[PDB]
């Protein structure tokens, strides 16, 4: 039982009915999945995303990612079709709540010169995306066993209908917004 | 004078189309519709063929129909 989940159904599940007046408890929003990907565009050249993007997202998240191939060739990017350019992991269930708790507690303040995340980065339904800029945010990877530094952007897909409904959920979980 | 050096050629006409019309009595094995693609689809007692050739599997009578937008050829034994 991950501790961000038992904290979710204790007071977060009940505080949302009093802010947004739902009739039924099957309308209370909940985060369904957290998707992290790298997007290693500098792997069309030199073809080294093996130790780079695969072996650190296994250490950050806990399971081995999927490698995403390119769908159409773009000449200016020197990109050919069917060439690995992206590395993606998808987190459900207990490994999701154990990622979001580990992200907001000990990782999201390790951003250099951190003054909060924007609360306007919702797409229109209540799904939040923000981008990390380095791997040293996480202790689970080390600076001395890695290749070149690379960032990642993290989707948090919720059951929310609109944005401020999804903003009130992630505020109650512990996302820091400015 | 110039020339039509770029034109002047054609392939042979392939004799495509309906070979047995509606209500017409056929034998087993008779070719009903010769076509490119499925302009017509098989029905009951009709098979497609290797180059979409819609023959007869059973002696009977040819009847045309509709089956969810597609037009089909069937045999009533």
């Amino acid at each position: 039982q991950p501790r961000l989940k038992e904290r979710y159904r204790s007071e977060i599940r009940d505080a949302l009915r009093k802010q947004f007046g739902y009739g039924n408890v099957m309308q209370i929003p909940t985060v369904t999945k957290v998707v992290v990907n790298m997007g290693v565009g500098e792997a069309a050249r030199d073809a080294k995303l093996i130790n780079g993007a695969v072996n650190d997202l296994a250490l950050i998240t806990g399971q081995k990612p999927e490698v995403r191939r390119a769908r159409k060739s773009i000449a200016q990017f020197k990109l050919r079709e069917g060439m690995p350019v992206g590395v993606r992991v998808t987190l459900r269930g207990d490994r999701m709540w154990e990622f979001l708790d580990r992200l907001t507690s000990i990782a999201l303040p390790r951003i250099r010169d951190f003054r909060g995340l924007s609360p306007k980065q919702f797409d229109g339904v209540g799904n939040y995306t923000f981008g990390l800029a380095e791997q040293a945010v996480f202790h689970e990877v080390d600076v001395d066993k890695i290749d070149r530094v690379r960032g990642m952007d993290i989707n948090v897909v919720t059951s929310a209908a609109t944005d401020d409904e999804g903003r009130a959920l992630l505020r109650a979980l512990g996302f820091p917004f400015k | 004078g110039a020339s039509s050096s770029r034109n002047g050629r054609d392939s042979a006409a392939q004799r495509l189309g309906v070979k047995r019309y509606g209500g017409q009595v056929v034998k087993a094995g008779e070719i009903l519709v010769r076509q490119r693609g499925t302009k017509f689809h098989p029905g009951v007692n009709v098979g497609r063929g290797g180059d979409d050739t819609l023959f007869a599997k059973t002696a009977g009578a040819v009847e045309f129909g509709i089956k969810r937008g597609r037009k089909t050829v069937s045999i009533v034994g």
């Binding site: - | 004078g1 110039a2 020339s3 039509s4 034109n7």
Partner: protein
């Protein structure tokens, strides 16, 4: 007037039979020239009729050309025998059937408008007439 692309550079002739079933009333303006017989109206003939209407009213008013020359006609080189390919396209032509409104005009004076259109009909290879908005 000339198209900027055609899909087919060499075409058959448009067919001069029938009565016009579309474009047979005055839509845009007040006065209109209506065709009474079949002809091929080239783009050189339309521009001679546009400058003939515009130089008789000289300012004030609005001229509509609801006819475009997008059908090409071909021509062999000059002193040639018959038949070693189709000739290169030379003319641009609109197919004009009886009933088809060709030009439309708005002008405040009825006399000058009806006289500016008469000068256009003497620039066209058709018998035509002037009609109004019923």
């Amino acid at each position: 007037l000339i198209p900027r692309k055609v899909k087919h550079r060499k075409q058959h002739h448009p067919r001069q039979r029938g009565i016009a079933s579309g474009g047979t009333t005055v839509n845009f303006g007040d006065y209109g020239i209506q065709a009474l017989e079949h002809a091929y109206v080239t783009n050189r003939q339309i521009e001679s009729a546009r400058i003939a209407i515009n130089r008789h009213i000289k300012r004030g008013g609005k001229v509509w050309i609801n006819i475009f020359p997008d059908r090409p006609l071909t021509k062999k080189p000059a002193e040639t025998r018959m038949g070693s390919g189709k000739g290169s396209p030379e003319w641009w032509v609109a197919n004009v059937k009886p009933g088809r409104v060709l030009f439309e005009l708005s002008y405040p004076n009825e006399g000058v408008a009806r006289a500016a259109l008469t000068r256009a009909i003497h620039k066209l290879p058709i018998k035509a007439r002037i009609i109004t908005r019923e």
